[PDB]
């Protein structure tokens, strides 16, 4: 509660000051309070704060709430991931110049979504929770975790003194929430795969066009994924270290798989195989990433730094894979 006092009374530095306009941005050295501050600057500089009558008081409480609802004990999927995603998302709209391509309702939704896309993530993938018959699997059908992340997001927005949306007409609110649901679900890698093909072609065939309502909301999914794993597009020293966390969290799951599940983990989560990391990274980048960031640049050239940083790390992993 004092955390709210101190926060809702500190000066929010400029975006320039905070270097949040950068695709090459890092949080490693920021404090907790600083990250929250960036967030506020994000909302502010996207005009979300003024166009939706947000009270400094409320936004602050809300942000704080999301912060405290990411698990500390969880290796990669903690608050700094939600934060690094939203900053990527923010960088995309500004420097990548996409803001000029979509509505204020969409921007708001993307930001709120980016921030909460992994709420209460318990450091384990959809595959595991399904195969271990977690009650969450009994509750939700497909995109289990992502459904939960949203159930949470929404719980918080309905919390008292957290209604950062309170200012919206009922129609606005109603469709914002729709988009937010779509956004969070889109961060399910399975949907990214089962949908990206479609989108890769409209690009390929120089046919892709935002105006099209459907073509847009597809792209909005693709944009979510884009930011969700933007970490892979970071300077080597950063990519290095954040890959260290993904590493541990995976291995942590791998342990559970053979200790409670009594199965063998995939090599990627097989702690013992730590020496096959870099090729596993390479294959993943090839399979999941380059493909996507290429696309994103065709849509917006100013988004190229992402593609550049991506293949640049792929370069360094490949080298390593060859010892």
């Amino acid at each position: 509660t004092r955390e709210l006092q101190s926060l809702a009374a500190a000066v929010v530095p400029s975006a320039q000051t905070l270097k949040i306009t950068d695709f090459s941005f890092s949080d490693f050295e920021l404090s907790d309070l600083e990250t929250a501050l960036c967030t506020i600057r994000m909302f502010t500089d996207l005009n979300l704060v003024q166009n939706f009558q947000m009270k400094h008081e409320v936004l602050c409480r809300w942000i704080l709430s999301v912060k405290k609802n990411y698990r500390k004990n969880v290796a990669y999927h903690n608050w700094r991931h939600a934060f690094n995603t939203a900053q990527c998302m923010f960088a995309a709209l500004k420097a990548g110049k996409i803001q000029n391509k979509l509505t204020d309702l969409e921007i708001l939704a993307l930001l709120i979504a980016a921030l909460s896309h992994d709420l209460d993530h318990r450091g384990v993938n959809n595959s595991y929770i399904q195969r271990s018959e977690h009650p969450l699997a009994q509750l939700y059908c497909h995109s289990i975790m992502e459904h939960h992340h949203f159930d949470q997001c929404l719980m918080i927005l309905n919390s008292p003194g957290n209604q950062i949306l309170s200012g919206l007409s009922i129609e606005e609110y109603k469709t914002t929430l729709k988009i937010i649901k779509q956004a969070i679900l889109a961060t399910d890698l399975a949907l990214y795969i089962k949908r990206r093909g479609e989108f890769f072609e409209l690009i390929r065939k120089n046919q892709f066009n935002l105006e099209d309502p459907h073509q847009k909301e597809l792209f909005l999914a693709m944009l979510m994924t884009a930011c969700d794993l933007s970490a892979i597009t970071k300077p080597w020293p950063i990519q290095q270290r954040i890959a260290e966390l993904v590493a541990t969290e995976f291995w942590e799951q791998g342990d559970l798989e053979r200790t409670v599940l009594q199965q063998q983990p995939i090599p990627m989560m097989d702690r013992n195989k730590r020496d096959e990391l870099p090729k596993l990274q390479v294959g993943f980048i090839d399979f999941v990433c380059t493909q996507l960031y290429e696309a994103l640049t065709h849509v917006s050239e100013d988004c190229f730094p992402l593609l550049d940083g991506c293949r640049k790390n792929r370069q360094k992993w490949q080298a390593l894979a060859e010892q």
């Binding site: 993938n125 959809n126 399975a190 795969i193 995939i266 993943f284 399979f287």
Partner: peptide, 17 residues
């Protein structure tokens, strides 16, 4: 989570599905 059977190996060897 039903995908083409050819995809299935790659999908699984990464944390997906």
């Amino acid at each position: 989570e039903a995908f083409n059977h050819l995809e299935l190996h790659e999908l699984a060897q990464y944390g997906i599905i």
